[PDB]
Amino acid sequence: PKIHYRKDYKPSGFIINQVTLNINIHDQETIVRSVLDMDISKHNVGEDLVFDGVGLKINEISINNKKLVEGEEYTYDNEFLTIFSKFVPKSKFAFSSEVIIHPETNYALTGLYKSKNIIVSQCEATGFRRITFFIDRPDMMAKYDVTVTADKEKYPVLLSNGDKVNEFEIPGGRHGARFNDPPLKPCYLFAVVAGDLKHLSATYITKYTKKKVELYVFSEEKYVSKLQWALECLKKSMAFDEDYFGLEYDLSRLNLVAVSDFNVGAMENKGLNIFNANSLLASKKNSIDFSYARILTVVGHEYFHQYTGNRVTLRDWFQLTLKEGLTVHRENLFSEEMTKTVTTRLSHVDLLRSVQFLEDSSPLSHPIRPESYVSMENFYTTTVYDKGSEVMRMYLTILGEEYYKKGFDIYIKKNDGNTATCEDFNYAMEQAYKMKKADNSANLNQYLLWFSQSGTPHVSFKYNYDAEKKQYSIHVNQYTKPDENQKEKKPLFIPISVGLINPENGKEMISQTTLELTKESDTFVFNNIAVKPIPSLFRGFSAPVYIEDQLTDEERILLLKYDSDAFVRYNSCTNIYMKQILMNYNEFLKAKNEKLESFQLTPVNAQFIDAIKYLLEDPHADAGFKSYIVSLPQDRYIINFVSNLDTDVLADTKEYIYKQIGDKLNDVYYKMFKSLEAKADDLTYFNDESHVDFDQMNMRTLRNTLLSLLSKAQYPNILNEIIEHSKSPYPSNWLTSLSVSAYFDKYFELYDKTYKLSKDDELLLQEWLKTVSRSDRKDIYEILKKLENEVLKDSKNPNDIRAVYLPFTNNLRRFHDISGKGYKLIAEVITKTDKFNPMVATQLCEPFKLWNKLDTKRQELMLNEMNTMLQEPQISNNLKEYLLRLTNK
Ligand SMILES: CC(C)(C)C(=O)N[C@@H](C(=O)NO)c1ccc(-n2cccn2)cc1
Ligand SMILES: [Zn+2]
C-alpha cells in the first residue's frame, strides 16, 4: 500500500514531447501501438526509466527501434514497466511498444472500455496507463498524434482530440481516422470514441472574434431525439462565459458524447466531452424534471473546464480542488443565472450541509487540498468539489464582481502555459485584495487555511442594543473541532454577509455589508440604528460553516416572513425545525429509555405554522421556496446535531412533527395542489424540447411535495387525485403517483402501470427503479428482491445498480432495521460490485459514512459488516483503503 505525500513532489527525470498512437480495435482484442519521443530532464540523476502500465499485455517494447528483452533489460509486473538505467539513453530517444488490451471485458469502466455498442475512454485520473505505457501524471505535457482503426459497420464514427486530418479505408471491411492535436496536454485529457453514433449539430459564432464553432452532440441512434436540450445548454454555456467572464471557446469544434455505462457524471477532454447518458439525454415524455437542471449543470461544468484547462494544468493531483472547485463555482454561477430561481442556490447549500458536512465530521474528513492519498479514485469527493466551490465562491464575496473578475485575469496571465498550485490562485486574488482595500500591505495569507484545514467551522452570535445610543453590536465567535488532521485549529478568514431588518416594517436598515471575521472572536458595532433590529446573517450562505444565530423562534419567523435574502429565510425555517426536532427527539428518547407508560411531547410552534400558511397562501411567493418550508431538514443534516442517533426515535420525531403541521394545514395543502394544476401541468411547450421553464418545474415540485404530505396523512379521497396524477404526461408526475400510492392498496397496480411506461427507455427505467427503491413500503425488502430477479438481474451498468440500492439506503426506518438486514444487504451488493467495478463499490459505501454517529447497537452492526467486507480476499485496493480510513484502522 503505497502512500503519496504532497510534500514529496519532485519533477520527473524524464520528458515526453510527442505521442504517436495507433489504436486498432478488433472483435476480441484491441492493439495499441505507441511511439513516445522522449528526452532527459534537468532533474535526472541516472535513474531507471519507469512507466506506468496496468494490465497491459506486452507484444514488444523498444528503444530507438531495437527490441528490449525481459529480465535483462526490463521488468514488468502488470503495474510498472522498469527499464534499467544502463539501457536508457542520455539524450533524445524514441520509446515504442505494442500492447494488447480488451475493452470488451473492461467492466471497471476505466481506460479503454466498451459501453453497449460504443468504444469509449476514461483516463482521469490514472486511466491512460490502462491503455498504454506512460509517465501517467498531469505535469507531463506532450503533443498527440492519434490513429484509430475499426470495423466500419460496427464503428463508422471515430473521434479523438484535435483535428481529424485523414480518413482511409482498410482491407477487410475496416477503416481508420487520424487525429492531430498540436497543443500540449496531460495524458488524462486524452480521449477516443468509436461507435455507430448519430448526432445533432449547430454552428456558434463567437462574440468577439466572430469565429464559427461547430457544435456536435452524439448518442446511439435509439435516443438521438433526446439530444436537443444538451445542444441548447452548450450554447448557453458559451454565451455565459462570453458575457460574464468575457472568454470565447478556443477551438473550432466541440463534441459531446453520451454513453450508457459511466462511473460519474461526465468528463472534460479537449474538444471531446464524454457524458453519462443520464446527464446529457432528456425528453419531456421520457424524463423527470430533474434531468433538465442536471444536464444544464453538467454540460456547463465540462464547458467551463476548457478555458482554464487550455492555459493552466495542475502540478499534481493534490491541487485537484483548484480546477474542480473553481469549475463547480463557475458552474453554479451559470446555473443560478440560467434558472433565475432562488432554489438553485438553496439546493447547493442543501447538498453541502447534508452530504459534505457529514463527510467533514466523519473519519474520512480531509481538507480540500489533502496532504496524502493511496488511491486517486477516492480523491474526488464532495469536500474537494463542493466545499472547494464554496471556498472559490468566498473570493467573489470578499472581492465583489469587479475585483474578482480582475484577480481571475491575474491568475490566468501569471500562470499561462505552466503548472499551478492553489497558492498561485490565492496570490492572484491577494493582488486584487490589495487593490480593493487601496493599501498594498493587505494580504490573504490566513485565507490559505481554507485549503489546508479540515472540518466545518462553527460560528455563533450574541447581540446587544442600546436604545438611547441607537447603537447595535454583533459579537461573533468561530470554532473548529479538532480532528485527526489538526490538533490545534486556527481561526479562518470568514466573510459574513449581513443585513439588519427593522422588525416593525421589514425594511433594510443598513447597506450591503460583509463582515470580515479573522480572529477567534470579534465585536462589530453599528451606530445610528433607530430601533432594535433582527440580524440577517450569512446572506446567500456566505461561508461554509455551522451557523448558530442564537435567535428566538419569533425573531426567526419574522425573518422567514420579511427578510430579503432567500437563504436566511430558508435557514431561519431550518433552525426553527431543528430546535423542534431536537426537543421532540429527546422527549421520545427519554420515553423509550425509561420505558414510560405515558409522557408529553412539545407541540410545534403555532406561530410558525401560521407563518407557513401565510407564505403558502401568498400568490406572489415562489413555488420552489414553498416546497422547502413544508419539508423537514434532511436526515443527514439532522444527524450532525445528535450523538448516538437512534434512527427509530428520529423517525418517530419526524412523523410527529409532520402530523402536527398536517393537522393544521392539510386543507391548505389540498387547496393549493388543486389550484396549481393548471400552470404546473401546462402542455403548451411539451413538444418543444428547447423550451424549459424552471418556475413551472418548481410548481410541479410543490404539487408533488404537497401530494406526498397529503397521501401520508391519508387525506379524505386523496387516492382519486393520486390516480388522476398517474395519467399525467409528465414523468415527474406519474412517477410521483407511484411513490405516494405506497400508502394505499393501489400501489402494485401503479407499479405495473409505471413499469410499462418506463421499460422501453433506458434512462426512464432507471428513474422508475429509483422511485420503487425509495417507496415508503413495509414490504420494501421483498420488493427489492423482486427488482433484482425481474429487472436488474446481473447488470453491470452503474446507473442500474445505483438506482436500485442507493435510494433505499435513505429509508430511515427500513434501511436502519435493527436486525442489520439492510446493512447486510448493501454490504453484499458492495462486495459483489467490487469484483468488476471498485469505484462504484466505493460509491455504494455511502450509507456507512455515518456509522459512528448512530446508536451503539447500529454502530456495532455497521462496523461488523464493514469488517466482513474488509476480510474479502479479493477486495480491491480502492474499497480496502476507503473502508480502512472509514473504520479508523
Ligand atoms: C457531476 C459532476 C460535476 C460531479 C462530475 O461528473 N464531475 C466530474 C468532473 O469533474 N468532470 O469534469 C468527475 C467526477 C468524479 C471523477 N472521478 C471520480 C473518481 C475519479 N474521477 C471524475 C470527474
Ligand atoms: Zn470537473
Per residue, what are the HEC states of 114-125?
EECCEEEEECCC
Shared domain check, 318 and 462: no
Query: Which of 454, 488, 511 is the C-terminal boundary of a domain?
Result: 454
| Rounded (to 5) percent helix, strand, coil in the chain | 45, 20, 35
Which grid cell is 825?
A: 444487504
Binding site membership of 351 for ligand 1 (Cβ less than 6 Å): no
Closest-CA residue to 777 (of 740, 749, 809, 806): 740
The ligand placed nearest to the CA atom of residue 322 is 2
**Experimental approach taken:** X-ray
Residue 301 in contact with ligand 1 by CB distance below 6 A = yes
Give the residue among 568, 667, 678 at the shortest CA–CA distance from 617.
Answer: 667
CA dihedral of residues 745, 736, 729, 232 (deg, nearest 10):
-160
Q: How far apart, in whole angstroms, are the C-alpha atoms of residue 161 and residue 309?
A: 14
Cβ atoms of 510 and 526 within 8 Å: the answer is: yes
- 658 and 676 share a domain? yes
Least Cα distance to 572 among 550, 594, 544 occurs for 550
Q: Mutate which of 268, 376, 380, 842 to test ligand 1's pocket (most atoms within 8 Å of Cβ)?
A: 380
State which H helix or E strand residue 18 sits in: strand 14-25
Smallest Cα–Cα separation from 259: which of 117, 102, 130, 126? 117
What residue owns the CA closest to ligand 1's atom 11?
267
How many CB atoms are located within 10 Å of the residue 187 CB? 25
* Integer Cα distance of 323 and 313 in angstroms: 8
The one-letter amino acid code at 26 reads: H
C-alpha 729: how far from its chain's center?
A: 29
Question: What spacing in Å lies between the alpha carbon of 385 and ligand 1's midpoint?
Answer: 9
Q: Are residues 564 and 542 in the same domain?
A: no
Q: Whose alpha carbon is nearest atom 9 of ligand 1?
A: 267
Segment (H or E) for 135 = none
- State how far the Cα of 531 lies from the Cα of 468, in Å rounded to an integer: 10
The verdict on 91 and 175 lying in the same domain is yes
- Rounded to whole angstroms, the Cα distance separating 560 from 572 reads 6
Query: What is d(CA 701, CA 288) in angstroms, rounded to the nearest whole number?
Result: 11
| CA 765 to ligand 2 centroid distance, Å | 27
Annotated binding site: 124, 265-266, 268, 301, 305, 324
Say if residue 772 is in the same domain as residue 757: yes
- Same domain (yes/no): 510, 573: no
Probe residue for ligand 1, chosen from 124, 382, 842 as the CB with the greatest number of ligand atoms within 8 Å: 124
Could you give the CA distance from residue 160 to residue 380 in angstroms, rounded to a whole number? 25
Burial class (CB in 10 A: 0-12, 13-18, 19+), 423: middle
**How much distance in Å is there from the Cα of 632 to the middle of ligand 2?**
31
Whether residues 80 and 202 fall in one domain: no
DSSP 814-834: TTT-TTSHHHHHHHHHHHHHH
Specify whether the CB–CB gap between 710 and 630 falls below 8 A. Answer: no
Q: Are 128 and 188 in contact (CB under 8 A)?
A: yes
Q: Which three cell numbers stand for residue 66?
A: 531495437
Cell 465530521 appears where? 361
State the CATH number of the domain containing residue 536.
Answer: 2.60.40.1840
The per-residue DSSP string of 831-853 comes to HHHHTT-HHHHHHTTGGGGGGGG
Residue-wise DSSP of 579-628: HHHHHHHHHHHHHHHTT-SS---PPPPHHHHHHHHHHHT-TTS-HHHHHH
Amino acid at 841: A
Check if the beta carbon of residue 58 is closer than 8 Å to that of residue 99.
Answer: yes
Query: Measured from the CB, is residue 52 less than 6 Å from ligand 1?
Result: no
Residue of 98, 302, 846, 865 marked catalytic: 302
**Are 649 and 760 members of one domain?**
yes
Q: Tell me if the bond preceding 125 is cis, omega within 30° of 0.
A: yes
Do the domain assignments include residue 658?
yes
CB atoms within 10 A of CB 298: 23
Asked if residues 384 and 324 have their Cβ atoms less than 8 Å apart, the reply is yes
Same domain, 253 and 367: no
Annotated binding site for a peptide: 124, 265-266, 268
Burial of 530 (0-12, 13-18, 19+ CB in 10 A): exposed
Query: Would you state the cell numbers that stand for residue 23, as one nine-digit string?
Result: 489504436
Same domain, 807 and 864: yes
- How far, in Å, CA of 661 to CA of 665, rounded? 6
Q: What is the largest CA-CA distance in the chain?
A: 95
Environment class of residue 695 by beta-carbon count within 10 Å: exposed (0-12), middle (13-18) or buried (19+)? middle
Q: How far apart are the first and last CA of the chain?
A: 14
Q: How far is CA 750 from the centre of its chain?
A: 32
Q: Give backbone dihedrals phi and psi of 37, rounded to 5 degrees, phi first.
A: -80, 105
Q: How many Cβ atoms are within 10 Å of 326's Cβ, its own excluded? A: 23
CATH (domain of 245): 3.30.2010.30
Cell of 400: 465583489
Distance between CA atoms of 392 and 404, rounded to whole angstroms?
Answer: 10
Q: Is 516 exposed, middle or buried (0-12, 13-18, 19+ CB in 10 A)?
A: exposed
Q: Measuring from atom 19 of ligand 1, which residue has the nearest CA?
A: 377
The verdict on the CB of residue 265 being under 6 Å from ligand 1 is yes
Q: Is 72 within the bounds of a domain? A: yes
Last residue of a domain, one of 263, 283, 303: 283
CB of 730 closer than 8 Å to CB of 700: yes
What torsion, rounded to 10 degrees, do the Cα atoms 752, 772, 788, 867 define?
A: -170
6 domain-assigned: no
Tell me: do 324 and 432 sit in the same domain. yes
The whole-angstrom separation of Cα 823 and Cα 480 is 32
Complete DSSP assignment for 202-231:
EEEE-SSS--EEEEEEEEEGGGGGG-HHHH
| CB half-sphere exposure, 716, CA atoms < 13 A | 3
Active-site annotation holds for 153: no
Q: 253-256, long-range: CB within 8 Å, 24+ apart, which pairs?
A: 253/213, 253/214, 253/215, 253/216, 254/213, 254/214, 254/215, 254/216, 254/303, 255/159, 255/216, 255/217, 255/218, 256/216, 256/217, 256/218, 256/230, 256/280, 256/299, 256/302
- Looking at the domain assignment, is residue 140 inside a domain? yes
**Domain harbouring 36, CATH code:** 2.60.40.1730
Is residue 634 a contact partner of residue 357, using CB atoms and an 8 Å limit?
no
Which residues are CB-contacts of 750 (< 8 A; sequence separation ≥ 6)?
A: 726, 737, 738, 741
Instruction: Say which residues have a Cβ less than 8 Å from residue 421's Cβ, sequence separation at least 6.
Output: 315, 319, 322
- Looking only at the bridges linking them, the beta strands covering 471-479 and 458-466 are antiparallel
Are 884 and 876 contacting, i.e. CB atoms less than 8 angstroms apart? no
Residue minimizing CA distance to atom 4 of ligand 1: 265
For 349, 606, 822, the CA distances from 629, given in Å and listed in that order, are 15, 15, 31
Phi/psi region, residue 109 (left: phi>0; alpha: psi -120 to 50; beta: rest), is left
All three cell numbers of 335? 446555473
Q: What are phi and psi of 46, to 5 degrees?
A: 70, 35
Here the contacts of 649-654 (C-beta below 8 Å, separation 24 or greater) are 649/585, 649/588, 649/589, 649/592, 650/581, 650/585, 650/812, 651/812, 651/813, 652/588, 653/581, 653/584, 653/585, 653/588, 654/581, 654/812
Q: Based on C-alpha coordinates, what's the Rg of the chain?
A: 28
Asked if residue 619 is part of any domain, the answer here is yes
Alpha carbon of 125 to ligand 1 centroid (Å) = 10
> Which one-letter amino acid corresponds to residue 600?
Q
Q: What is the DSSP letter of 681?
A: T
Helices and strands, number each (H, E), in the chain: 27, 31
Does residue 158 lie in a domain region?
Answer: yes
**What is the amino acid identity at position 882?**
Y
Host domain of residue 756: 551-889
Distance in angstroms (rounded) separating the CA atoms of residues 538 and 526 = 17
Domain assignment present for 3? no
346 burial type by CB count under 10 A (0-12 exposed, 13-18 middle, 19+ buried): buried
CA pair distance 261, 118, nearest whole angstrom: 10
- Strand pairing of 212-220 and 197-205? antiparallel
What residue type is assigned to position 864 of the chain?
Answer: N
Q: Is the CB of 124 under 6 A from ligand 1?
A: yes
Q: Which of 488, 484, 509 is nearest to 499 (CA)?
A: 509
Query: What phi, psi does 389 have (nearest 5°)?
Result: -65, -40
Q: Which of 515, 550, 585 is the last residue of a domain?
A: 550
Q: State the CATH number of the domain containing residue 588.
A: 1.25.50.10
| Integer Cα distance of 821 and 812 in angstroms | 13
Query: From atom 5 of ligand 1, which residue's Cα is the shortest distance away?
Result: 265
Q: What is the distance between the alpha carbons of residues 877 and 887, in angstroms, rounded to a whole number?
A: 15
Rounded to 5 degrees, φ, ψ at 563 are -70, 155
Our count of domains for the chain comes to: 5
CA of 189 to the centre of ligand 2 (A): 12
Q: Is residue 2, in this structure, part of any structural domain at all?
A: no
Q: Are residues 279 and 331 in the same domain?
A: no
Q: Where do runs of H (alpha helix) occur along 310-421?
A: 320-339, 343-351, 357-360, 382, 388-414
Count of residues for the chain? Answer: 889
Helix axes 694-712, 718-725, angle to 10 degrees: 140
